[PDB]
């Protein structure tokens, strides 16, 4: 810990996180690809633009909130630019939906509480970096988001894909101190 340390990374863990979500089949899939490192890492890719309406429900575990009203999280994903696709079809979504899940340690499971809530829309660009890789991910997309509704607790990421081609590159969480010491 020279300066700051990360909460948890999908690559840092490598092993399963406790996934328990996915469509019937063809949608989200677990495939290992080559990363900047020699050793391969477990990733996920979901590409299906043959019918807009699919509501791919994906859950992410291994997360925790901090004191700060909110926390810092960085998700890395790669999607196939339809603009680069010569005659893709014209039925591909160029947007994503991010949701969260919060709850108490042990009180009750109210429909209101359980009722998830979207965070914001994430899409390629914004912070796209060009890396010389031979795996596939030619256009990496990085999105910075935060979450910290329920002060009591509750930390869970949720992904939703609808007729869109996007893959997960990596994910990391980190805490930041917005309120600095001011006397």
From Swiss-Prot:
Where's the Eph LBD domain? Answer: 4-183
Which compartments is it annotated to reside in?
Answer: Cell membrane; Cell projection, Axon; Cell projection, Dendrite; Postsynaptic density membrane
* Tissue note: Ubiquitous.
Look up the domain of life of the source. Answer: Eukaryota
**Notes concerning its domains:** The protein kinase domain mediates interaction with NGEF.
Quaternary structure (record): Heterotetramer upon binding of the ligand. The heterotetramer is composed of an ephrin dimer and a receptor dimer. Oligomerization is probably required to induce biological responses. Interacts with CDK5, CDK5R1 and NGEF; upon activation by EFNA1 induces NGEF phosphorylation by the kinase CDK5. Interacts with CHN1; effector of EPHA4 in axon guidance linking EPHA4 activation to RAC1 regulation.
In which family does this protein belong, per the annotation?
Belongs to the protein kinase superfamily. Tyr protein kinase family. Ephrin receptor subfamily.
The function of this protein is: Receptor tyrosine kinase which binds membrane-bound ephrin family ligands residing on adjacent cells, leading to contact-dependent bidirectional signaling into neighboring cells. The signaling pathway downstream of the receptor is referred to as forward signaling while the signaling pathway downstream of the ephrin ligand is referred to as reverse signaling. Highly promiscuous, it has the unique property among Eph receptors to bind and to be physiologically activated by both GPI-anchored ephrin-A and transmembrane ephrin-B ligands including EFNA1 and EFNB3.
Name the chain's protein: Ephrin type-A receptor 4
Lineage start? Eukaryota, Metazoa, Chordata, Craniata, Vertebrata
């Amino acid at each position: 810990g020279s300066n700051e340390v990360t909460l948890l990374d999908s690559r840092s863990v490598q092993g399963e996180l406790g996934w328990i979500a996915s469509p019937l089949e063809g949608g989200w899939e677990e495939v290992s690809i080559m990363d900047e490192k020699n050793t391969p890492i477990r990733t996920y890719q979901v590409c299906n633009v043959m019918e807009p309406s699919q509501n791919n429900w994906l859950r992410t575990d291994w997360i925790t909130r901090e004191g700060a009203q909110r926390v810092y999280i960085e998700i890395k994903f790669t999607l196939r630019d339809c603009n680069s696709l010569p005659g893709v079809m014209g039925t591909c979504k160029e947007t994503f939906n991010l949701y969260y899940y919060e709850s108490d340690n042990d009180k009750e499971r109210f429909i209101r509480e359980n009722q998830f809530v979207k965070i914001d829309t994430i899409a390629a660009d914004e912070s796209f970096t060009q890396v010389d890789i031979g795996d596939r991910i030619m256009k990496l997309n990085t999105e910075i988001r935060d979450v910290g509704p329920l002060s009591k607790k509750g930390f869970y990421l949720a992904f939703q894909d609808v007729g869109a081609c996007i893959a997960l590159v990596s994910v990391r969480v980190f805490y930041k101190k917005a309120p600095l010491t001011v006397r």
